[PDB]
Structure 1
Amino acid sequence: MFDKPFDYENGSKFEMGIWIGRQMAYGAFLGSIPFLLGLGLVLGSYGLGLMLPERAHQAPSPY
């Protein structure tokens, strides 16, 4: 529904360019899925820590 073949025979240049753009946009969305998941994980954990008591951010360093 997102990755579709192109009808090269009986196909205009403008449609070909739009199709290449759509394929690359779908690829960009697929590549954005892990970036968005990681950003959400990090920021949500940080926000939850911000909502934690004050002692959560004062633990001794394990090194």
Structure 2
Amino acid sequence: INLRVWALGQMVWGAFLAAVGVVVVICLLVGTYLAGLLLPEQSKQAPSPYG
């Protein structure tokens, strides 16, 4: 009853925080990739530094 919903709320709040962090990291990375898609094509033709 009350204790079950309390503990489930605690666990789901933890999961929601984790999901927010994941969403943030993914938004950052993906948006960087997209902004990279706006750059000139020589941005993708650079020679490797072998390392």
Larger radius of gyration: 1
Question: Structure 1: any 5+ residue segments left out of the alignment?
Answer: 1-13
TM-score between the two structures when normalised by the length of structure 1 = 0.67
Question: Structure 2: any 5+ residue segments left out of the alignment?
Answer: none
Provide the alpha-carbon RMSD of the alignment: 1.3
TM-score between the two structures when normalised by the length of structure 2 = 0.78
Which of 24, 27, 41 is the equivalent residue of 2:11? 24
More helix by share: 2
Q: Which has the higher contact order (CA 8 A, sep 6+)?
A: 1
> 4+ runs of 1 displaced by more than 4 Å?
none
